Design a protein around this nucleic acid. Structure first.
Ligand code: MG
Ligand code: MG
Ligand code: MG
Ligand code: MG
Ligand code: MG
Ligand code: MG
Ligand code: MG
Ligand code: MG
Ligand code: MG
Ligand code: MG
Ligand code: MG
Ligand code: MG
Ligand code: MG
Ligand code: MG
Ligand code: MG
Ligand code: MG
Ligand code: MG
Ligand code: MG
Ligand code: MG
Ligand code: MG
Ligand code: MG
Ligand code: MG
Ligand code: MG
Ligand code: MG
Ligand code: MG
Ligand code: MG
Ligand code: MG
Ligand code: MG
Ligand code: MG
Ligand code: MG
Ligand code: MG
Ligand code: MG
Ligand code: MG
Ligand code: MG
Lengths: 136, 76, 116, 67, 177, 51
RNA sequence: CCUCCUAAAGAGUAACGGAGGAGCACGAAGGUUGGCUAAUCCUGGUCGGACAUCAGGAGGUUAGUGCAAUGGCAUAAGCCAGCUUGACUGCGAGCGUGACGGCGCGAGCAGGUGCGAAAGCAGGUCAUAGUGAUCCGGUGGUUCUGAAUGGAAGGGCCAUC
RNA sequence: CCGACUUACCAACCCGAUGCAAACUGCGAAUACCGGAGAAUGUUAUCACGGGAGACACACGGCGGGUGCUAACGUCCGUC
RNA sequence: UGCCUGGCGGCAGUAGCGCGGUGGUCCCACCUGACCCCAUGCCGAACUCAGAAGUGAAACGCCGUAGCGCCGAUGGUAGUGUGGGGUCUCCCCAUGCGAGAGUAGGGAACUGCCAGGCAU
């Protein structure tokens, strides 16, 4: 699964998730799957959406993944009390703001793309929509 | 469990700001290294403390080929 | 590079002299010629100036770049200053290592008067 | 050049085979009798060949002399 | 000066024509010669390195500098500052003199010759060159030798381009292959 | 840890002494710096003795 | 006890919050004067190799700093040499930091030094850790005290364990 | 002894494009804070010294956060 | 008064770099000597001295050119003080403040004191 090969630090503060996104244009492909909502995308959710949309084009054209999960998320074991240090890293996420183009496709017809991205979207916790390039 | 340590804060920073009237001796900045450089009528201590060498008013300025920050006493 | 290596070599003393706010007698020497000037504390205003390019000084000299041209310049300037109003002064090697021609200039100026 | 740290460096005479003689400065401290100067040398003079290859057929016709 | 002299009339004036150097200053001259000989086997026993020194002093006519490792390397198990070689810079009278000797005595004693290379140039025009044994120089005396030992010999020049150098060398009848 | 303590003693016979530290393993050489004795009010020789 | 973050652009600010260090070392690794500039790659070159030392080029501090991290550093605070003991004694306008005990910075006076032709610089070290109150004792010094008086013992004061 | 043909595959430095950071910064606010000047207003509201205290278990709500599951009428700081 | 050049500053990339031209009367540089003063952990390379046969080749100065660096609006967006509000992990409204990036564009520095040489 997508995951930094290594990091300066093991654990990160929670932080917040305010703001609108940077990366709102289809930059590589012809079609993209843009995020309307706000939330976290886990490595697993990314891999599951990626497999869905691959399989329904039968490895024709080219898929970019624009987001990458580089925020580690810790959890406390079951039946342990509060305190005694921060928990252990369990999975990784990417922070999504409204506007973040998530995936890009190219080299297939628009109506196929539509159906590929519709499937991948059923695997995602965030409301998404379909987008195209713009001359400018 | 392996963490839980820290040192005592040193109250570094500017003690006298631009335009303030000071007496000879008064400390202007406490700092680590010369984040500010002593200018006219200003000394530099062994822990890079800048102090007024003559009664007057504090003045900051940027000067020189490196764009360094200087502190001087106008003897107003 | 020579001049860069020289300018660098001078700058510490040049700057010290600023802070102290001293009238400085500043030298300069090349193969053929030696020069002197005395600059106002601001560092931007010459007061008196003497060299082996002014015809008046040169017409004596066997050669304009030696330890005797030095003494000539190392006197003209000291006369022209003591008669102006300038007794106390600080000497400025300016990279050149206090020796030979540069030192010759200086010694002569201590004879005339200039109190450094 | 610093004083009294370097070895003695002096005139000598260097007489080759081919009579060639050259006054030269060196430490060696006495006259040489050398055997191959830059004049006495195959390479400098233009002599050395490069070993004759491709003799097998010349060889064979020189060796036997047969119709 | 032999070749300094030869340089100052014969060499300069030939090269003068064949490149069309308007200014004479444009003509390549030889700046300096330098004779390195690294002696790693020093870290083993330090006597060896000094024993080199005398060789290089006997060849060249002046005491060598003793060089030391710039950084530590574990590859050769050395640490920054141990003496591991020695050089001599040659610049004037002596430089032209040794050069004379090199051509007209030393180099035609190379155990089986075929001239020297004309490929060994840095790209700006400074000729580098090794010597496998040090009996080549009659300065040493072969029955008073501890070890066979070598050196680099690098001729630093004011030549601009690789090519322009080669010319300067050749014009001293330098034995290239 | 390893550096001992020593007293440097005036040569002017006054008694007055300074104190300092020393690595004796590495540098076992009776240290002889020159310091200002204020009982005679002049710089003199001082010589390492034991604390 | 020190350094960074959390700490919300002055200071300060908690948790069995997130990451790391210290309980020294140096008579030079201190003072001053004079001089000097890094890493790394490429090209050529005896042994010699991806890497030793040599020559040139590109590069521009990506090096370096006795030891963590942060802030500094080319006028270098980095690297090398000559001479040296300012790693001085008495003091101290004024200011910083603490509930306090305390801790820190300091120009200038007086005496006597070192380096420099001089102007000048020097009261330890690029800075910030390397530390233990008081009592009770020890050692040296001392125009102090000395239970009738002269001494002495003990006590004080200054230096130190 | 080198080679030579061929790459169904991997890809360093460099170049172009797209992101992310509490312990990144060739940028940088609003506020807050320090100092100076001036009006109006305020029962001196300010500072110093002296007599007498109590208190040193805090709670929730808003805003900025650490911790926790952006769980808790949870827990730990800043601020009203 | 003009043109050159050297020294010391102000200013600190609109001022730096690159690419192309160009200058030796004076200045500057390279340069020529080296016993001497002084010097090299070897080397007159550097530092130092005594000089003027040579050349502006390098260097340096000057002039031109937008391949780079650098500077940079207007507008919009982000954020945020105070007062309201919601569908309240995040936003919206009134008012005040208002970036960074990017875009048009700018740009081959400007300026003081002293000296020297030429021209008028
Ligand atoms: Mg925040
Ligand atoms: Mg964001
Ligand atoms: Mg701290
Ligand atoms: Mg001080
Ligand atoms: Mg703060
Ligand atoms: Mg704040
Ligand atoms: Mg609290
Ligand atoms: Mg805490
Ligand atoms: Mg040190
Ligand atoms: Mg120095
Ligand atoms: Mg190599
Ligand atoms: Mg190099
Ligand atoms: Mg570094
Ligand atoms: Mg130092
Ligand atoms: Mg006081
Ligand atoms: Mg003296
Ligand atoms: Mg330190
Ligand atoms: Mg008791
Ligand atoms: Mg008595
Ligand atoms: Mg009695
Ligand atoms: Mg106010
Ligand atoms: Mg007021
Ligand atoms: Mg309590
Ligand atoms: Mg409490
Ligand atoms: Mg509580
Ligand atoms: Mg509370
Ligand atoms: Mg909250
Ligand atoms: Mg309730
Ligand atoms: Mg509660
Ligand atoms: Mg010269
Ligand atoms: Mg802009
Ligand atoms: Mg705007
Ligand atoms: Mg802007
Ligand atoms: Mg230009």
């Amino acid at each position: 699964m997508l995951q930094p090969k290594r990091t300066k630090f093991r654990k990160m503060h929670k932080g917040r998730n305010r703001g609108l996104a940077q990366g709102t244009d289809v930059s590589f492909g012809s079609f993209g799957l843009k995020a309307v909502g706000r939330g976290r995308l886990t490595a697993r959710q990314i891999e599951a959406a990626r497999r869905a949309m691959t399989r329904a084009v039968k490895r024709q054209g080219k898929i970019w993944i624009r987001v990458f999960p580089d925020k580690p998320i810790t959890e406390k074991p079951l039946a342990v009390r509060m305190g005694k240090g921060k928990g252990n890293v369990e999975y990784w996420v990417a922070l999504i703001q409204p506007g973040k183009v998530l995936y890009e496709m190219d080299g297939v017809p628009e109506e196929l793309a539509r159906e590929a991205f519709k499937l991948a979207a059923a695997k995602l916790p965030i409301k998404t929509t379909f987008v195209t390039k713009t001359v400018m | 469990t392996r963490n839980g340590r820290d040192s005592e804060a040193k109250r570094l920073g500017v003690k006298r700001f631009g335009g303030e009237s000071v007496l000879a001796g008064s400390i202007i900045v406490r700092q680590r290294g010369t984040k500010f450089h002593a200018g006219a009528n200003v000394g530099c201590g062994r822990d890079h403390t800048l102090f007024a060498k003559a009664d007057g008013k504090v003045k900051f300025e940027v000067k020189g080929p490196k764009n360094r920050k200087f502190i001087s006493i106008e003897a107003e | 590079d020579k001049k860069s290596a020289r300018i660098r070599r001078a700058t510490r003393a040049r700057r010290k002299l600023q802070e102290l706010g001293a009238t400085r007698l500043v030298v300069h020497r090349t193969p053929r010629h030696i020069y002197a000037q005395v600059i106002a504390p601001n560092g931007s205003e010459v007061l008196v100036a003497a060299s082996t390019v002014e015809k008046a000084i040169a017409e004596q000299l066997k050669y304009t770049g030696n330890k005797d041209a030095a003494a000539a310049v190392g006197k003209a300037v000291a006369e022209r200053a003591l008669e102006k109003g300038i007794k106390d002064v600080s000497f400025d090697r300016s990279g050149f290592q206090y020796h030979g021609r540069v030192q010759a200039l200086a010694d002569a100026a201590r004879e005339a008067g200039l109190q450094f | 050049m610093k004083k009294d740290i370097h070895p003695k460096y002096e005139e000598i005479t260097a007489s080759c085979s081919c009579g060639n003689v050259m006054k030269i400065r060196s430490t060696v401290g006495h006259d040489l009798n050398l055997d191959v100067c830059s004049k006495c040398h195959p390479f400098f003079t233009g002599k050395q060949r490069d070993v004759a290859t491709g003799g097998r057929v010349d060889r064979f016709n020189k060796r036997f002399n047969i119709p | 000066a032999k070749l300094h002299d030869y340089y100052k009339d014969e060499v300069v004036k030939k090269l003068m024509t064949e490149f069309n150097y308007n200014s004479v200053m444009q003509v390549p001259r030889v700046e300096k010669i330098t004779l390195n000989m690294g002696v790693g086997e020093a870290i083993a026993d330090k006597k060896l390195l000094d024993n080199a020194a005398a060789d290089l002093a006997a060849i060249s006519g002046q005491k060598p500098l003793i060089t030391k490792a710039r950084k530590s390397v574990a590859g050769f198990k050395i640490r920054q500052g141990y003496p591991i070689g020695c050089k001599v810079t040659l610049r004037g009278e002596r430089m032209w003199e040794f050069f004379e000797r090199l051509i007209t005595i030393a180099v035609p004693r190379i155990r089986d010759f075929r001239g020297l290379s004309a490929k060994s140039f840095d790209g700006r025009g400074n000729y580098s060159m090794g010597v496998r044994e040090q009996i080549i120089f009659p300065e040493i005396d072969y029955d008073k030798v501890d070890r066979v030992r070598g050196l680099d010999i690098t001729i630093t020049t004011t030549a601009k381009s690789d090519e322009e150098g080669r010319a300067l060398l050749a014009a001293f009848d330098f034995p290239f292959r | 840890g390893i550096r001992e303590k020593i007293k440097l003693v005036s040569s002017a016979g006054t008694g007055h002494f300074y104190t300092t530290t020393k690595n004796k393993r590495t540098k076992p050489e009776k240290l002889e710096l020159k310091k200002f004795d204020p009982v005679v009010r002049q710089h003199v020789i001082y010589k390492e003795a034991k604390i």
